[PDB]
Amino acid sequence: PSQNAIKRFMTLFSGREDVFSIQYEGGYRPIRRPLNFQDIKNHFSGKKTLGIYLLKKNDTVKFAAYDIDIKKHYLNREDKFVYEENSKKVAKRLSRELNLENITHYFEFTGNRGYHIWIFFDIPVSAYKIKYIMEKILDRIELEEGIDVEIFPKQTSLNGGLGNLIKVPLGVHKKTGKKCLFVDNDFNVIENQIEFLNNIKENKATEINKLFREIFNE
Ligand SMILES: Nc1nc2c(ncn2[C@H]2C[C@H](O)[C@@H](COP(=O)(O)OP(=O)(O)OP(=O)(O)O)O2)c(=O)[nH]1
Ligand SMILES: [Mn+2]
Ligand SMILES: [Mn+2]
Q: Report which bound ligand comes closest to the CA of 175.
A: 1
Instruction: Tell the burial category of 59 from Cβ atoms under 10 Å away from its Cβ (0-12, 13-18, 19+).
Output: middle
Rg of the chain (C-alpha set): 17
Angstrom distance (rounded) from CA 82 to CA 86: 6
Contact of 176 with 70, CB cutoff 8 Å: no
DSSP β-ladder status, 27-31 and 114-126: unpaired
Range of the domain at 138: 2-217
Tell me the CA–centroid distance for residue 2 and ligand 2, in Å.
31
Q: What would the DSSP string read from start to end of 70-113?
A: E-GGGTTSTTHHHHHHHHHHHHHHHHHHHHHTT---EEEE-SSS
| Nearest C-alpha neighbor of 67 from the set 145, 158, 131, 123 | 131
In single-letter form, the type of residue at position 135 comes to: E
Ligand 1 pocket list (CB less than 6 A): 27-28, 51, 67, 69, 110-114, 165-167, 173, 175
Angstrom distance (rounded) from CA 25 to CA 38: 22
DSSP state of 33: S
Q: Whose CA is nearest to atom 29 of ligand 1?
A: 27
Tell me the CA–centroid distance for residue 3 and ligand 2, in Å.
32
H-run or E-run covering 200:
none
Experimental method: X-ray
Tell me the CA–centroid distance for residue 24 and ligand 1, in Å.
11
Angle at 183 between CA 179 and CA 189, to 5 degrees: 65
What is the best residue among 55, 66, 69 to mutate for testing ligand 1's pocket, by most ligand atoms within 8 Å of CB? Answer: 69
Count how many domains the chain has. 1
Give the CATH number, domain containing residue 165.
Answer: 3.90.920.20
